Amino acid sequence: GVEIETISPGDGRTFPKKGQTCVVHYTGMLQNGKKFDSSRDRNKPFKFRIGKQEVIKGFEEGAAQMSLGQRAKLTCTPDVAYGATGHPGVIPPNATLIFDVELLNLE
């Protein structure tokens, strides 16, 4: 269940497609919890492509449903990323993830 709530501006037509490397200033957030990740802190804006199972499923499906300049608000379900296992020390088991996603990409 990828639920998109978009802060408006952008163009609404430059869509991410296959074989495209894209750049996101993401920001992580735990539901009823504190922060755990920010690409804005390291100032390295996480160049990545679509389709090679690099990122989690909840962030992968949220990437194609956006466009350039847009600003969405993900809500990743536990069953798509880590809810059975959980990343050791960082992500607890059965966790629901919140992401502040802005797409400022190329290709």
Side-chain angles (χ1 to χ4, degrees), residues 60-78:
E60 185 178 3
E61 294 179 354
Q65 294 181 358
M66 291 178 68
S67 179
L68 176 59
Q70 292 182 354
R71 184 175 179 178
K73 184 176 184 292
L74 290 175
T75 302
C76 292
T77 63

mmCIF file of all heavy atoms in Angstrom, residues 60-78:
data_model
loop_
_atom_site.group_PDB
_atom_site.id
_atom_site.type_symbol
_atom_site.label_atom_id
_atom_site.label_comp_id
_atom_site.label_asym_id
_atom_site.label_seq_id
_atom_site.Cartn_x
_atom_site.Cartn_y
_atom_site.Cartn_z
ATOM 1 N N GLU A 60 10.567 1.844 -4.296
ATOM 2 C CA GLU A 60 10.653 1.629 -5.735
ATOM 3 C C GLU A 60 9.335 1.959 -6.420
ATOM 4 O O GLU A 60 9.322 2.584 -7.487
ATOM 5 C CB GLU A 60 11.059 0.186 -6.023
ATOM 6 C CG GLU A 60 11.297 -0.116 -7.489
ATOM 7 C CD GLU A 60 11.734 -1.548 -7.718
ATOM 8 O OE1 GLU A 60 11.802 -2.313 -6.734
ATOM 9 O OE2 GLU A 60 12.018 -1.909 -8.881
ATOM 10 N N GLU A 61 8.215 1.550 -5.821
ATOM 11 C CA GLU A 61 6.912 1.857 -6.394
ATOM 12 C C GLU A 61 6.571 3.333 -6.252
ATOM 13 O O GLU A 61 5.874 3.893 -7.106
ATOM 14 C CB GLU A 61 5.835 0.999 -5.735
ATOM 15 C CG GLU A 61 5.973 -0.485 -6.024
ATOM 16 C CD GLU A 61 4.913 -1.315 -5.331
ATOM 17 O OE1 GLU A 61 4.144 -0.749 -4.527
ATOM 18 O OE2 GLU A 61 4.848 -2.535 -5.589
ATOM 19 N N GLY A 62 7.057 3.980 -5.191
ATOM 20 C CA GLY A 62 6.827 5.401 -5.022
ATOM 21 C C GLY A 62 7.640 6.270 -5.956
ATOM 22 O O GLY A 62 7.318 7.450 -6.125
ATOM 23 N N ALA A 63 8.688 5.712 -6.567
ATOM 24 C CA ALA A 63 9.523 6.499 -7.467
ATOM 25 C C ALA A 63 8.834 6.734 -8.804
ATOM 26 O O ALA A 63 8.863 7.851 -9.336
ATOM 27 C CB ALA A 63 10.869 5.805 -7.673
ATOM 28 N N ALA A 64 8.202 5.698 -9.361
ATOM 29 C CA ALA A 64 7.594 5.811 -10.681
ATOM 30 C C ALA A 64 6.317 6.638 -10.671
ATOM 31 O O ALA A 64 5.908 7.131 -11.728
ATOM 32 C CB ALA A 64 7.303 4.422 -11.246
ATOM 33 N N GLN A 65 5.681 6.809 -9.513
ATOM 34 C CA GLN A 65 4.434 7.550 -9.412
ATOM 35 C C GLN A 65 4.650 9.038 -9.165
ATOM 36 O O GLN A 65 3.701 9.738 -8.793
ATOM 37 C CB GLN A 65 3.556 6.962 -8.306
ATOM 38 C CG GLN A 65 3.065 5.558 -8.593
ATOM 39 C CD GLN A 65 2.175 5.022 -7.495
ATOM 40 O OE1 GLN A 65 1.945 5.687 -6.488
ATOM 41 N NE2 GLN A 65 1.670 3.810 -7.681
ATOM 42 N N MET A 66 5.862 9.535 -9.363
ATOM 43 C CA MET A 66 6.178 10.941 -9.169
ATOM 44 C C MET A 66 6.667 11.548 -10.483
ATOM 45 O O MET A 66 6.588 10.928 -11.546
ATOM 46 C CB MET A 66 7.216 11.116 -8.061
ATOM 47 C CG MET A 66 6.710 10.784 -6.677
ATOM 48 S SD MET A 66 8.024 10.970 -5.463
ATOM 49 C CE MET A 66 8.250 12.748 -5.502
ATOM 50 N N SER A 67 7.160 12.781 -10.400
ATOM 51 C CA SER A 67 7.768 13.449 -11.541
ATOM 52 C C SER A 67 8.819 14.429 -11.033
ATOM 53 O O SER A 67 9.065 14.537 -9.829
ATOM 54 C CB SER A 67 6.719 14.155 -12.403
ATOM 55 O OG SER A 67 7.326 14.821 -13.497
ATOM 56 N N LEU A 68 9.436 15.144 -11.972
ATOM 57 C CA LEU A 68 10.524 16.059 -11.649
ATOM 58 C C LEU A 68 10.021 17.268 -10.874
ATOM 59 O O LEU A 68 8.999 17.867 -11.214
ATOM 60 C CB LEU A 68 11.227 16.516 -12.928
ATOM 61 C CG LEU A 68 12.340 17.561 -12.797
ATOM 62 C CD1 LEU A 68 13.461 17.081 -11.896
ATOM 63 C CD2 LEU A 68 12.886 17.922 -14.167
ATOM 64 N N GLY A 69 10.750 17.618 -9.815
ATOM 65 C CA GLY A 69 10.410 18.749 -8.985
ATOM 66 C C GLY A 69 9.352 18.481 -7.944
ATOM 67 O O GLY A 69 9.111 19.349 -7.096
ATOM 68 N N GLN A 70 8.719 17.313 -7.968
ATOM 69 C CA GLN A 70 7.615 17.030 -7.072
ATOM 70 C C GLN A 70 8.118 16.696 -5.671
ATOM 71 O O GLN A 70 9.312 16.503 -5.431
ATOM 72 C CB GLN A 70 6.764 15.893 -7.623
ATOM 73 C CG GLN A 70 6.019 16.267 -8.884
ATOM 74 C CD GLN A 70 5.143 15.148 -9.379
ATOM 75 O OE1 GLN A 70 5.174 14.044 -8.846
ATOM 76 N NE2 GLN A 70 4.333 15.433 -10.388
ATOM 77 N N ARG A 71 7.173 16.621 -4.739
ATOM 78 C CA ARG A 71 7.499 16.472 -3.324
ATOM 79 C C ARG A 71 6.380 15.652 -2.688
ATOM 80 O O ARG A 71 5.341 16.202 -2.318
ATOM 81 C CB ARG A 71 7.649 17.835 -2.669
ATOM 82 C CG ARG A 71 8.083 17.807 -1.226
ATOM 83 C CD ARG A 71 8.304 19.223 -0.729
ATOM 84 N NE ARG A 71 8.709 19.260 0.671
ATOM 85 C CZ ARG A 71 9.002 20.376 1.331
ATOM 86 N NH1 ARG A 71 8.937 21.547 0.714
ATOM 87 N NH2 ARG A 71 9.362 20.321 2.606
ATOM 88 N N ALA A 72 6.596 14.350 -2.572
ATOM 89 C CA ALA A 72 5.567 13.445 -2.098
ATOM 90 C C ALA A 72 5.778 13.129 -0.621
ATOM 91 O O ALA A 72 6.615 13.731 0.058
ATOM 92 C CB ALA A 72 5.550 12.175 -2.949
ATOM 93 N N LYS A 73 5.001 12.176 -0.113
ATOM 94 C CA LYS A 73 5.077 11.778 1.290
ATOM 95 C C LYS A 73 4.683 10.307 1.359
ATOM 96 O O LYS A 73 3.492 9.984 1.405
ATOM 97 C CB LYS A 73 4.171 12.649 2.146
ATOM 98 C CG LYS A 73 4.244 12.371 3.630
ATOM 99 C CD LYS A 73 3.372 13.354 4.388
ATOM 100 C CE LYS A 73 3.498 13.169 5.885
ATOM 101 N NZ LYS A 73 2.912 11.877 6.323
ATOM 102 N N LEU A 74 5.681 9.429 1.368
ATOM 103 C CA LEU A 74 5.423 7.999 1.324
ATOM 104 C C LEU A 74 4.907 7.486 2.662
ATOM 105 O O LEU A 74 5.017 8.140 3.701
ATOM 106 C CB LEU A 74 6.688 7.227 0.958
ATOM 107 C CG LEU A 74 7.221 7.356 -0.463
ATOM 108 C CD1 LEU A 74 8.544 6.625 -0.585
ATOM 109 C CD2 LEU A 74 6.215 6.787 -1.434
ATOM 110 N N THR A 75 4.333 6.286 2.616
ATOM 111 C CA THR A 75 3.985 5.530 3.818
ATOM 112 C C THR A 75 4.189 4.059 3.452
ATOM 113 O O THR A 75 3.291 3.409 2.913
ATOM 114 C CB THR A 75 2.564 5.808 4.281
ATOM 115 O OG1 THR A 75 2.404 7.212 4.522
ATOM 116 C CG2 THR A 75 2.267 5.056 5.571
ATOM 117 N N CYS A 76 5.381 3.551 3.742
ATOM 118 C CA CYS A 76 5.745 2.209 3.316
ATOM 119 C C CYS A 76 5.240 1.178 4.315
ATOM 120 O O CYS A 76 5.465 1.300 5.522
ATOM 121 C CB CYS A 76 7.257 2.092 3.144
ATOM 122 S SG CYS A 76 7.910 3.061 1.765
ATOM 123 N N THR A 77 4.553 0.166 3.797
ATOM 124 C CA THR A 77 3.999 -0.893 4.613
ATOM 125 C C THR A 77 5.121 -1.784 5.146
ATOM 126 O O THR A 77 6.220 -1.805 4.587
ATOM 127 C CB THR A 77 3.004 -1.699 3.782
ATOM 128 O OG1 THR A 77 3.690 -2.314 2.686
ATOM 129 C CG2 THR A 77 1.916 -0.787 3.239
ATOM 130 N N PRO A 78 4.888 -2.496 6.256
ATOM 131 C CA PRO A 78 5.944 -3.379 6.777
ATOM 132 C C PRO A 78 6.268 -4.556 5.876
ATOM 133 O O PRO A 78 7.436 -4.958 5.806
ATOM 134 C CB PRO A 78 5.376 -3.848 8.122
ATOM 135 C CG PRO A 78 4.431 -2.788 8.515
ATOM 136 C CD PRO A 78 3.811 -2.311 7.246
#
